Amino acid sequence: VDLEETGRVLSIGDGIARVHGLRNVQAEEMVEFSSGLKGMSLNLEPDNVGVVVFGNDKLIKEGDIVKRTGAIVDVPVGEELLGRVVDALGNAIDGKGPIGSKARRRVGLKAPGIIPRISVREPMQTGIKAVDSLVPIGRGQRELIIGDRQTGKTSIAIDTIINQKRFNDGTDEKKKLYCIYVAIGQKRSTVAQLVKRLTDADAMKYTIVVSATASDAAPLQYLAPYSGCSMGEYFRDNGKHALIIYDDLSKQAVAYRQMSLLLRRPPGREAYPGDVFYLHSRLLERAAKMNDAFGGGSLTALPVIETQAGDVSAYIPTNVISITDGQIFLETELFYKGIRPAINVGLSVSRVGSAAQTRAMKQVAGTMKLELAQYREVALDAATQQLLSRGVRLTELLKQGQYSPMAIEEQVAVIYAGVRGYLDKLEPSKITKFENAFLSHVISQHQALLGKIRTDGKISEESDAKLKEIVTNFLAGFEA
């Protein structure tokens, strides 16, 4: 009797089944328990199998027969998770019955090759000016969303997601980004609202929501990203662009550590196990911006880290930091001020963001970015007072609260205005007001122009003169 493929639950911690037997099991096999649970024969001990139980028991009582499934894990992967809330096993906690994903693919598959990979050149946008502007961003890219709590964080992801609506629902094949929200340890409620929210916002049709809620068993919660990852590659390699938002890995890590510890497989720094950089590294290395062989596709990773008091020195954050291609650092004070964006800009980073995005924005943004620096810097001179004026104007201008995503052109337009100091000839409150009106004004009128600007991929000088004129007309013409 198999005590070489099957085992009797020798002891079960309460989630680590020490299982006598199983031997012939191959390492990292999904097993299935006589509690109906799943397990992974993770630890092939020379005696018994540490089987991480992929389930919740009090079903298990010792002696329970632990059965091989005989399989190393794959997950259903596909493209039909778009419009689906799922759990990692590939079951769909959406309660939309079960998903359409059906091909299965090892989550254990790894990092693309250099040649398979092809550097970012491909924009990535959020409808959030500050982001798109101040982060110059491509797709494939890891960028850390780092911040503590939806403090719009979560909002942030949403506005982006929502933003993709116009694109995915646009025929932006290239900007047909499958959103993968791996919801790691999130309250169901949060998700609920969220789910609802997104649904209401319906980005969701072109969206996977992998939902591992707060309760969810740890290896599962842990697993979910890898799952998601497999699924996103599913697009990637398939030409398409998936965006996985790994939300959030802090919780994953925790779970994971915990998991380790329960396996009595040691901790490490901050009681956290040693591979944990590696953990993500291998995961995220599986994310890529591909070459053409993969239809050029991408899996853009917006991993999320929830800091504890913005502490990132923190081994795991440092870890992550050393991997990411930048971070979106969020700062409370501005949020709290109501300033959304709330960001600490300094702390938000793109090491070399600009090599995969858009002239339009670029043309105004570089210079602007700088002006803001200057504006910011100085903790009166007409100049500086000006920078401040501007700066503040621009603050409004980059201020788009939570629930505000956009087509880019709208953004560049307004930015342009501000960079012409047009806005400095306005009270800052009325920048915002103006902006709204203005926006509906250009939307109305110069949708023509915007259409074009969107068209040129850049801002034309010509367009600029029309725009200038537009803006000015609106400006002047609604300056009060």
Partner: protein, 466 residues
């Protein structure tokens, strides 16, 4: 099955169960045990040995003893007759008004609704505390995490909130005194009875009391939490009744858990903190919400271990929050009651939408004012202060005034304060600040804002100062 106590090494009672065993969690009754000493199988320690937890005292126990598995986990009385009852973890009236004869017993592991099964939407309830509503508005089902110091009036505040609410809101309550101060339950008792929140004329109340006092074994203290948890789901789904769930203290629950983990010869993580710290919570927290059949609104006291919040436990806590009131000790110390932190006495669920957009904006402005103001504090602290610029100075004052205005007297602690408490209508609050935003209290000083209700009274109070 019957097991033998093979080891009691402390209350980790290793029982090797000998007519087989049932699964984990199954509650065992120790045979020869004076009272019903339920041991909850916690682990199949293997070899038909379980690591179990005693929740009773183990003193004087002959080892080698015989335990007879109660064959299931612990079940405890459920049904309305529990309102106006102080139940211990194991049901058992520690109201000691004789039995709570209920028709239902329940094993204290209650479960979480799948996504589809829970109302996926929120509400906005309110509280009448300026500070609260303004910064962290309310909703239902929402678990609020309340930090700070019991009897600063942290604990008092909870009560006061109960005081208006349970009465006012129908939708039942659970009070969980986890490692409760027995004494505090007593007094409170005479008060509740008195108060008629607790009715004894009718076994029910509107509220069930669960006390799982400090002197209980941790297992008991840890577990009293699930017990209560089980109840509210009963009230929600079964009884409709929208529990306000007072947890004092989930940290004390936790502590009982961690302590336990240790003893469970597990690896209880950094700071000793239980490996499972999160799972205990996740599984628990998700057993709380606005389902379709009601809401279990949690008022969660979290007293802060070694008073740090960067502390993982609170880190965890945060994940489940809906509103958080982080009292500031600094503020409390500044002789401010409420003791608020005005930077994470929050609701994400304050939105222009959820509250007035104004409400919100006004709040954002306020939130701003304070936020900026704090920034100045450091500077001021070093450097004296006065040359920053006056508008700021104004904000500063305003902020302080606001501070003082947030200080809102309380009747229940009028006894102490001499301050007649104020629960404040929303408008007065909004206005309050708006007025302040309009900076009208020119002349009027800081202390004119201390411990008032509606903002007029502060204006008035300046006058009273004069």
């Amino acid at each position: 099955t019957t097991g033998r106590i093979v080891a009691v090494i402390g209350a980790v009672v290793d029982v090797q169960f000998d007519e087989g065993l049932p699964p984990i969690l199954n509650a065992l009754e120790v045979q020869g045990r004076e009272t019903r000493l339920v041991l909850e199988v916690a682990q199949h320690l293997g070899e038909s040995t379980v690591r179990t937890i005693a929740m009773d005292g183990t003193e004087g126990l002959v080892r080698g003893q015989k335990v007879l598995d109660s064959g299931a986990p612990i079940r405890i009385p459920v049904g309305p007759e529990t309102l106006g009852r102080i139940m211990n973890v194991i049901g058992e009236p520690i109201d000691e008004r004789g039995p709570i004869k209920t028709k239902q017993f329940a094993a204290i592991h209650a479960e979480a609704p799948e996504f589809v099964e829970m109302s996926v939407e929120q509400e906005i309830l309110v509280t009448g505390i300026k500070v609260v509503d303004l910064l962290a508005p309310y909703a239902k089902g929402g678990k609020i995490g309340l930090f700070g110091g019991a009897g600063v009036g942290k604990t008092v505040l909870i009560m006061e909130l109960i005081n208006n609410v349970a009465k006012a809101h129908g939708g039942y309550s659970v009070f969980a005194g986890v490692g409760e101060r027995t004494r505090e339950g007593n007094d409170l008792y005479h008060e509740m009875i008195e108060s008629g929140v607790i009715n004894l004329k009718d076994a029910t109340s509107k509220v069930a009391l669960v006390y799982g006092q400090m002197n209980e074994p941790p297992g008991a203290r840890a577990r009293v939490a699930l017990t209560g948890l089980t109840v509210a789901e009963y009230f929600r789904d079964q009884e409709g009744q929208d529990v306000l769930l007072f947890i004092d203290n989930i940290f004390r629950f936790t502590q009982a858990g961690s302590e336990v983990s240790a003893l469970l010869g597990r690896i209880p993580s950094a700071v000793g903190y239980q490996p499972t710290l999160a799972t205990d919570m996740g599984t628990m927290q998700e057993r709380i919400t606005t389902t379709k059949k009601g809401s279990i609104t949690s008022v969660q006291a979290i007293y802060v271990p070694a008073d740090d919040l960067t502390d993982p436990a609170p880190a965890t806590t945060f994940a489940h929050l809906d509103a958080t009131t982080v009292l500031s000790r600094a503020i409390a110390e500044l002789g401010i009651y409420p003791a608020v932190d005005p930077l994470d006495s929050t609701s994400r669920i304050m939105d222009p939408n959820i509250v007035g957009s104004e409400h919100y904006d006004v709040a954002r402005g306020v939130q701003k004012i304070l936020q900026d103001y704090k920034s100045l504090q450091d500077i001021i602290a070093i450097l004296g202060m006065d040359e920053l610029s006056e508008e700021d100075k104004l904000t500063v004052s305003r902020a302080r005034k606001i501070q003082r205005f947030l200080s809102q007297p309380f009747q229940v602690a009028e006894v102490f304060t001499g301050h007649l408490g104020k629960l404040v209508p929303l408008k007065e609050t909004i206005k309050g600040f708006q007025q302040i935003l309009a900076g009208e209290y020119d002349h009027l000083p800081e202390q004119a804002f201390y411990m008032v209700g509606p903002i007029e009274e502060a204006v008035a109070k300046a006058d009273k100062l004069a």
